[PDB]
Amino acid sequence: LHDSIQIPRQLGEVASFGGSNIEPSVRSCFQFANNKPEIEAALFLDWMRLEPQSMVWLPVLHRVAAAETAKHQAKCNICKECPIIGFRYRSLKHFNYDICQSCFFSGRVAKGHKMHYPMVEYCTPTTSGEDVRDFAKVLKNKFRTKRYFAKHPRMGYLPVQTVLE
Amino acid sequence: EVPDRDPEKSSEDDVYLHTVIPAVVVAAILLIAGIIAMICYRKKRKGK
Ligand SMILES: [Zn+2]
């Protein structure tokens, strides 16, 4: 854990992953393993397969490496990019809304719609089943209004959604 | 011996069969092909 967090410490951002305090990670891993005397390979695999807070930089990195040469059949509603190269971000409480990665991280705030709503992240080009499922999710959300849950501050919004390759 | 009776009810059924049916079946084939193509066409993610 210490050797791993050394890399964010070099770049001065280890505080986001919880800082140099590796003990809470040990506490969580033992809580998963019901305080087992020893930890094996499979248990560690399952423990990290659920986005551990301190380790998010391993998968995301590879995920970025998996989305540097991906071309989607869509457009960016803000900068009128066509087609989006790289990541793709789809809205859920709106229809026909998509934004590129740069338009998302930088914050091109077009008047009328904010960016503090749930999103969906796509690395690989999508398929028809994903599109129709997104349509169904949008329709279901359209009748689940009145702000059941809201998150205005950022505080760290890294685990957006899992694509399961 | 020369009997002649005319109860013949002529009807143009050959023209109908020769003309309407082929286009109807062609239209049905085109419609089913289009529907199948729309349901299909990138429903599978070829990983790796
Ligand atoms: Zn954009």
Coordinates of C-alpha atoms in Angstrom, one line a residue, chain A residues 10 13 25 36 38 45 50 53 55 57-59 70-72 75 78 81 85 96 106 108 112 114-115 120 122 125 151:
Chain A
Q10 CA 5.2 12.4 -5.9
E13 CA -2.4 14.4 -4.8
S25 CA -7.2 0.2 3.9
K36 CA -8.9 -13.9 8.6
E38 CA -4.0 -14.6 6.2
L45 CA -8.7 -10.0 -6.3
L50 CA -14.9 -3.2 -6.0
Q53 CA -10.6 4.2 -2.6
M55 CA -6.3 2.1 -5.7
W57 CA -5.5 4.9 -10.2
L58 CA -4.7 1.3 -11.4
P59 CA -7.9 0.4 -13.3
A70 CA -12.0 4.6 -29.8
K71 CA -14.3 6.3 -32.3
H72 CA -18.0 6.6 -31.4
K75 CA -21.6 14.1 -31.5
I78 CA -21.4 21.5 -26.7
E81 CA -17.3 17.6 -32.2
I85 CA -12.7 10.5 -30.1
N96 CA -30.1 13.0 -27.0
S106 CA -13.1 21.5 -18.3
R108 CA -18.1 24.2 -20.8
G112 CA -29.9 25.9 -19.7
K114 CA -26.0 22.0 -15.5
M115 CA -23.5 19.2 -15.0
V120 CA -22.9 7.4 -17.8
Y122 CA -18.5 4.8 -22.1
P125 CA -18.2 2.0 -28.8
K151 CA -24.8 16.0 -5.0

